[PDB]
C-alpha cells in the first residue's frame, strides 16, 4: 500500500515527529509497519527541475511514478572524459562498443594524433552503447516510464527527478530499502490500484508551496480517479524537540440565541487555525458556551481564542465576518456552540521576516483592543520568565502625548481651516452624516489639513522618540498606521496587524476620551486614510509566536533543575572601570543539552557602546539603568537555535549588589558574553 500526505516525509525524522498524530491519525501503538519514504531529495529535484522545464510537464510526469518500485539513475561524464575513462582502467568496457574502438583503446600509444581514431571517436555516440539513455532534451515522461520499468537508468545530465543520482566514473572525470505494507510519503501517484491520498487538509493551508503546487495541479486534473481517505479511515486501516512548530485546527461553531428555552441557530462560522495547545489548555470541547459572562464584555478566553488565530468567515457566504464588539442589535453574539474540528496540520510559527534580534513595531487600527490585550498579555509568565512585561511595550499614544500642545489637541483646532465650522461638534456633524461612513469629499477637505500636522510635527517628534526608545533596550511599539513608522524612520521589524472585530464600534463604546466619541472616530478615519494600503495580516500571527513556544517548552523543562536549564546573554564590562556587571539583553530557557551547546558558541564578535548611569529604579532589586547601541552587526537568530525559548523584549539596566555607591556613569565599549551558572 501507499499513502500520500501534504508534508515533506522523511525516513529519519518523520518517524520521530511521527506526522500521523500530526495530521490526526491514531497510529500510536506498536505499529512499526507504517514505513516512511525519502522525499527530501525529490522535493529538491522538483525545485531544481522547475528551473528549466515547465511546471505542467514536470508535475504530470512525476505523478506517474511507482514509488514502491526501487530504481536509480547514474549519470555518465561527457564523451571525451568518458573515452578517457574507457582507456585508463579499460577492463570495464561494455561489449556493445565497436570492435575497432575497443581494439584501438586497448593500445598503449600516446594517442596524440591517431588519424583513424579521431574519425572513430567522431562517429561514436553515447546513445547506441547504453540502451536506456535519457537525454539532454528528454522531454520528461520517458524518464518516469524508464524508472517504472527497470532497475538502472543512464543519464547524461543532472536535471532528473524520481530517484537518486549515482556516479559512474570516479570524481576526477566530473566538474565540481525494504517495504512495510503501509508505505507513506508526499507526492501522490496513480501508478497502482493501491495508491491513496489522505484528504482532510485544505489546499490553501499547505505550507511548503512546492507540495502545494503539486497538489493543486494534480487535483485539478485527476480529481475523479484519485482515492481519498480521511484520517479516521487511515487509522482504521492501520489498526532535540523543535519548538515553533505547533499543531493548528479550526473550530466549527454557530451562534445561538437561547431566550426563554427556545434554541435558534442563527449563523455558522469557522475560526481558521487556532493552535491545538490553547484549546487543550482552556478545556474546549463540543458544548454550549457564553462568551460574555458579565456586563457585555467578552469572557476573554474567547478573546484569547479570537486573538490567537486567523479570522472567522461565514459558511453560507464564503466571506470574512468580523464579529460585533458591542452589545447592541441587529447582531450580537452572546451564546455559541462548538460543533467540530476540521483540518489539522503543523505550521512554522517563526515568521521569515524575523531573522535578526531587533525591536518590533506592531501597527494596529485605532479602535482595537490594545489596552485589554496588554492587560491580558502582561500576566503570562510561564517558567518565571514574564514573557511580555507591561514596561517593555510602548503605548500607541505615547509619541503624541509628549508635546506641549499634544497631537490630538493640535488636531482638535483643525476646524479653523475649514470654510466654516465654528466648533468641534459642527465639524463632527459636517463630516459623517447620521451614521458613520462620512462624506468622502468633506473627509478629503479635512484630510488636506490633517496631513501637514502629521508630516511636520508628528514625524519629526517620532524620529527622535523612537531613537531614544531604541537606545534603552528592545521594546514592542504600537502605532495607528504604517506611515507613522515609515516617515519617522523606524528601525526594527514592521509588522502590520489586524483584529477580527469591527473596530469602529469601540470608538462609540468607550466613554472618557479627549473630544467626543465622534471626534475619536473621525480621527481614526484620518489615520486609516493615511495608511498606504498593504495587507494587515491577522494580529494573531504575532501572539501565536509570543505564547505558543513557551507552552511547549514548559512540558520539556517543567520539572528539571532551574540552574541546569537557564541562561542569560548580555553586554560585559571588566571588573575594572568602576571609576563585573553586565546588562542582560536576553534570557534563554531551554533543556540542559542545548544549554551545553550554546555555552560554546562565539557570542563575542558583537560589540556595542554601553553608557551606564547612576540613576536608581523604584523596582525591588537594586539596579541602575543603562543604555546600549549595537555596532557593526545584529545578533542573528540562528545562534539561539530553534530549540530554545528566548524573550523578544528587554530593558537595559545593571544591578549593583556590592559596595553600594553609584559613581559618575560612563561609556565602556562592552562585548557580548554568554552568562549561565555551572549547570
Amino acid at each position: 500500500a501507499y499513502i500520500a500526505v501534504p508534508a515533506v516525509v522523511d525516513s529519519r525524522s518523520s518517524e520521530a515527529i511521527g506526522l500521523l498524530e500530526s495530521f490526526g491519525v491514531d497510529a500510536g501503538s506498536d505499529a512499526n509497519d507504517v514505513s516512511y519514504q525519502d522525499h527530501d531529495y525529490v522535493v529538491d529535484q522538483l525545485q531544481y527541475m522547475l528551473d528549466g522545464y515547465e511546471a505542467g510537464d514536470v508535475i504530470d510526469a512525476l505523478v506517474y511514478r511507482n514509488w514502491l518500485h526501487h530504481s536509480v539513475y547514474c549519470l555518465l561524464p561527457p564523451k571525451s572524459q568518458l573515452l578517457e575513462y574507457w582507456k585508463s582502467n579499460p577492463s570495464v568496457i561494455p561489449d556493445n562498443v565497436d570492435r575497432r574502438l575497443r581494439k584501438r583503446l586497448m593500445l598503449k600509444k600516446d594517442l596524440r594524433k591517431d588519424d583513424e581514431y579521431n574519425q572513430l571517436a567522431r562517429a561514436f555516440k553515447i546513445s547506441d552503447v547504453y540502451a536506456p539513455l535519457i537525454s539532454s532534451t528528454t522531454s520528461p515522461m520517458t524518464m518516469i516510464q524508464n524508472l517504472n520499468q527497470g532497475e538502472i537508468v543512464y543519464t547524461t545530465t543532472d536535471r532528473v527527478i524520481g530517484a537518486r543520482v549515482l556516479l559512474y566514473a570516479p570524481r576526477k572525470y566530473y566538474a565540481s530499502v525494504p517495504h512495510s505494507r503501509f508505505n507513506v510519503g508526499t507526492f501522490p501517484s496513480i501508478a497502482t490500484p493501491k495508491c491513496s491520498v489522505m484528504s482532510g487538509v485544505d489546499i490553501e493551508s499547505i505550507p511548503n508551496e512546492f507540495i502545494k503546487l503539486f497538489y493543486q495541479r494534480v487535483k485539478s486534473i485527476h480529481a475523479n480517479i484519485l482515492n481519498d481517505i480521511s484520517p479516521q479511515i487511515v487509522s482504521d486501516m492501520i489498526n532535540h524537540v523543535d519548538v515553533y512548530r505547533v499543531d493548528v485546527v479550526n473550530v466549527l461553531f454557530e451562534v445561538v440565541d437561547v431566550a426563554d428555552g427556545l434554541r435558534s441557530v442563527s449563523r455558522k462560522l469557522i475560526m481558521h487555525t487556532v493552535p491545538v495547545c490553547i484549546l487543550e489548555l482552556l478545556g474546549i470541547e463540543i458544548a454550549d458556551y457564553c462568551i460574555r459572562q458579565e456586563d457585555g464584555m467578552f469572557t476573554d478566553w474567547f478573546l484569547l481564542l479570537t486573538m490567537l488565530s486567523d479570522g472567522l468567515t461565514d459558511r453560507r457566504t464564503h466571506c470574512q465576518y468580523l464579529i460585533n464588539p458591542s452589545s447592541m442589535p441587529p447582531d450580537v453574539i452572546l451564546n455559541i456552540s462548538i460543533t467540530g474540528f476540521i483540518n489539522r496540520h503543523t505550521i512554522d510559527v517563526m515568521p521569515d521576516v524575523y531573522d535578526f534580534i531587533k525591536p518590533i513595531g506592531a501597527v494596529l487600527p485605532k479602535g482595537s483592543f490594545k489596552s485589554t490585550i496588554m492587560r491580558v498579555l502582561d500576566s503570562i509568565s510561564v517558567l518565571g520568565v514574564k514573557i511580555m512585561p507591561r514596561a517593555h511595550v510602548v503605548d500607541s499614544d505615547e509619541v503624541g502625548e509628549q508635546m506641549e500642545p499634544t497631537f490630538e489637541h493640535a488636531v482638535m483646532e483643525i476646524y479653523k481651516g475649514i470654510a466654516g465650522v465654528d466648533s468641534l461638534d459642527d465639524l463632527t456633524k459636517w463630516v459623517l452624516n447620521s451614521d458613520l461612513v462620512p462624506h468622502d469629499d468633506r473627509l478629503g477637505q479635512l484630510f488636506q489639513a490633517f496631513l501637514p500636522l502629521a508630516k511636520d510635527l508628528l514625524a519629526p517628534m517620532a524620529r527622535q522618540f523612537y531613537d531614544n526608545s531604541m537606545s534603552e533596550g528592545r521594546l514592542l511599539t504600537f502605532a495607528h498606521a504604517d506611515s507613522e513608522l515609515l516617515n519617522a524612520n523606524y528601525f526594527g521589524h514592521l509588522l502590520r496587524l489586524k483584529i477580527p472585530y469591527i473596530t469602529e464600534v469601540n470608538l462609540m463604546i468607550r466613554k472618557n476620551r479627549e473630544g467626543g466619541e465622534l471626534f475619536q472616530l473621525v480621527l481614526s478615519y484620518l489615520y486609516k486614510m493615511y495608511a498606504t494600503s498593504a495587507q494587515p495580516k491577522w494580529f494573531g500571527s504575532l501572539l501565536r509566536l509570543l505564547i505558543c513556544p513557551w507552552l511547549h517548552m514548559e512540558k520539556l523543562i517543567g520539572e528539571a533543575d532551574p540552574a541546569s536549564t537557564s541562561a542569560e546573554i548580555g553586554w560585559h564590562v571588566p571588573r575594572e572601570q568602576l571609576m563585573d556587571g553586565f546588562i542582560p539583553y536576553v534570557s534563554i530557557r531551554a533543556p540542559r543539552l542545548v544549554i551545553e551547546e550554546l555555552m560554546e558558541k562565539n557570542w563575542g564578535q558583537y560589540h556595542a557602546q554601553v553608557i551606564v548611569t547612576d540613576q536608581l529604579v523604584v523596582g525591588e532589586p537594586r539596579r541602575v539603568s543603562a543604555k546600549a547601541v549595537i555596532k557593526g552587526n545584529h545578533l542573528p537568530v540562528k545562534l539561539i537555535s530553534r530549540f530554545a525559548c528566548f524573550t523578544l523584549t528587554s530593558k537595559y539596566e545593571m544591578r549593583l549588589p556590592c559596595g553600594h555607591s553609584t559613581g559618575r556613569g560612563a561609556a565602556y565599549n562592552a562585548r557580548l558574553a554568554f552568562r549561565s551558572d555551572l549547570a
Binding site: 520499468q149 532497475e151 538502472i152
Partner: protein, 68 residues
Amino acid sequence: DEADDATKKQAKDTEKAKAQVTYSDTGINNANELSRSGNVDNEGGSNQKPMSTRIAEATSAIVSKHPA
C-alpha cells in the same frame, strides 16, 4: 507485486543484478488479470471489517438485559 518479486527472485537465482527472463513489463497488455487478495471475503464482499467483528456486531445489536 508478485511479478516484480518473481523477477527479483530470478535475478538473485541467476546471480545477476538485471534479470533476463522476466514476468512483468512484458509485451502483452495483461491489464484485466486478477489475483487472490485479502480484500475480498467469500460472499464477494469487501474485507475491511473482518467477518468475526461483523458477526459480533450484528449479534450484539439484538441482545437484551435484566429489568431493574
